[PDB]
Amino acid sequence: NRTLIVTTILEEPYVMYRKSDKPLYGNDRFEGYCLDLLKELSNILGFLYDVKLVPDGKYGAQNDKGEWNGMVKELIDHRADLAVAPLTITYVREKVIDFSKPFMTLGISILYRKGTPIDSADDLAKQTKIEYGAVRDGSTMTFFKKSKISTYEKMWAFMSSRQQSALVKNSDEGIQRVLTTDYALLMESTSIEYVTQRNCNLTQIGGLIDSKGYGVGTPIGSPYRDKITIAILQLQEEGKLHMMKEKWWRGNGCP
Numbered sequence: 001n002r003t004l005i006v007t008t009i010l011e012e013p014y015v016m017y018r019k020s021d022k023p024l025y026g027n028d029r030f031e032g033y034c035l036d037l038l039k040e041l042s043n044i045l046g047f048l049y050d051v052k053l054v055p056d057g058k059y060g061a062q063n064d065k066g067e068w069n070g071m072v073k074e075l076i077d078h079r080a081d082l083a084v085a086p087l088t089i090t091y092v093r094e095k096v097i098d099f100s101k102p103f104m105t106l107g108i109s110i111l112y113r114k115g116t117p118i119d120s121a122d123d124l125a126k127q128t129k130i131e132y133g134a135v136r137d138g139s140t141m142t143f144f145k146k147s148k149i150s151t152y153e154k155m156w157a158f159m160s161s162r163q164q165s166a167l168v169k170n171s172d173e174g175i176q177r178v179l180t181t182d183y184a185l186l187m188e189s190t191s192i193e194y195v196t197q198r199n200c201n202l203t204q205i206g207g208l209i210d211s212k213g214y215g216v217g218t219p220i221g222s223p224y225r226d227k228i229t230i231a232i233l234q235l236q237e238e239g240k241l242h243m244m245k246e247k248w249w250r251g252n253g254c255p
C-alpha cells in the first residue's frame with residue numbers, strides 16, 4: 001500500500017498551479033489534464049500518490065556522456081514510480097524506460113505569426129532572417145539534433161549555432177519570444193492548438209512533421225506497468241480521454 005511518487009512538470013493546460021486565496025498544500029496545489037488523468041488512474045487501479053515537480057524542470061534528454069536528466073532521469077534512478085505529464089514516447093527513450101499505450105496523439109509543428117508567406121519547415125530552413133528554435137532538452141530538440149534529414153540537419157545547425165541563442169528554457173519563454181520578436185517556435189501540435197486559440201495573431205505553419213503520442217512513464221520492469229496501460233485503454237474506450245481533452249482545451253476560439 002505504498003504511496004507512489006509521481007514526477008511531472010509545469011505545462012499548460014496539463015499541469016498548473018490552482019488559483020485560490022486559500023493557501024493550498026499537497027496535490028491540491030495542482031490541476032489540469034494530467035492531474036485529472038492521474039486521478040482517474042488512482043481510482044481505476046486504487047493507489048495513493050504524491051505529485052513531485054521534476055527538480056531540474058526538464059523533460060529529459062541524454063547529454064554527451066549518455067547521461068539523462070529531467071523526468072526520464074527521475075524514473076531511471078527510481079526516484080519516481082511513474083511520470084504523468086505531456087511526456088513524448090520516443091524510440092531512444094524506450095531504451096531506458098517504459099511507456100503506456102498513448103493517452104494523446106500529436107506531432108511536431110511550427111508556431112508563428114500569421115499573415116506571412118512562410119508555409120513550411122523548408123521555408124524556415126532555407127532562410128535565416130526569421131529566427132527559430134525549440135525547448136531545450138526535450139524530444140523536439142533531440143528530434144532535430146539527431147535527424148538525418150537534410151532539411152532538419154540544416155535547421156539544427158541554425159538553432160544550435162554559436163552566432164546566437166535560438167533555444168528556449170521552456171514553452172512560455174518560447175511563446176513570449178514568438179509574440180515579441182520575429183521568431184517561430186517548433187512545438188508539439190496539441191499545445192500549438194491551445195496557444196493559437198488564445199492568441200489570434202498566431203497560427204500553425206504547415207502540418208505535423210512527425211506523428212507520435214504521450215504516454216505514462218514507469219521504470220522499466222514496473223509492477224504497475226501493465227495495469228496502467230489497461231486503465232488507459234478503458235478510459236479511451238469509455239470516451240473519457242476525449243472528454244478530458246475537450247474540458248481543458250475548450251475556449252472562445254478565434255474570429
Ligand SMILES: N[C@@H](C[C@]1(C(=O)O)C[C@H]2OCCC[C@H]2O1)C(=O)O
Binds near residue numbers: 087089139141191
Ligand atoms: N513533449 C516533449 C517536451 C516538449 C517538446 O520538446 O516538444 C516541450 C514542451 O513544449 C510545449 C508542448 C509540450 C512540451 O513538448 C517531451 O516529452 O520531451
